[PDB]
Amino acid sequence: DATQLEGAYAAAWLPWIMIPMITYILPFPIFAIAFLWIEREG
């Protein structure tokens, strides 16, 4: 029946790439950008 993740909805390939980007690809760049922002010197 459900051997893997599926989408019975329109553009069901979008979770497949959106969950990696939002959750483990773009976050460490965002953390690096915020760390460089809070540690930059006057």
Partner 1 sequence: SDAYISDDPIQPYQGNPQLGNLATPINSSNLAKAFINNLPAYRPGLTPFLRGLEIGMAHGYFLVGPEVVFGPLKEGSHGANLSGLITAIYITVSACLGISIFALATFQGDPRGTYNSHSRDRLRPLRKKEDWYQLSGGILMGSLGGAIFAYALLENFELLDSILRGAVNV
Partner 2 sequence: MALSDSQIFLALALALIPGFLALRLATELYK
- Cα separation values, 34 from 21, 22, 29, 37, Å: 17, 16, 9, 5
Residues that contact partner 1, how many (by CB under 8 A): 14
Q: 6 vs 13, which CB is nearer to ligand LHG?
A: 13
Percentage helix, strand, coil for the chain under 3-state DSSP, each rounded to 5 = 60, 0, 40
Per CB under 6 A, which of residues 3..42 are in contact with ligand CLA? Answer: 14-15, 18-20, 22, 25-27, 29-30
Among partner 1, partner 2, ligand CLA, none, residue 10 binds (CB under 5-8 Å by kind): partner 2
Helices (H), the chain: 14-20, 27-39
Provide the binding-site residues for partner 2, judged by CB under 8 A.
9-11, 14, 37
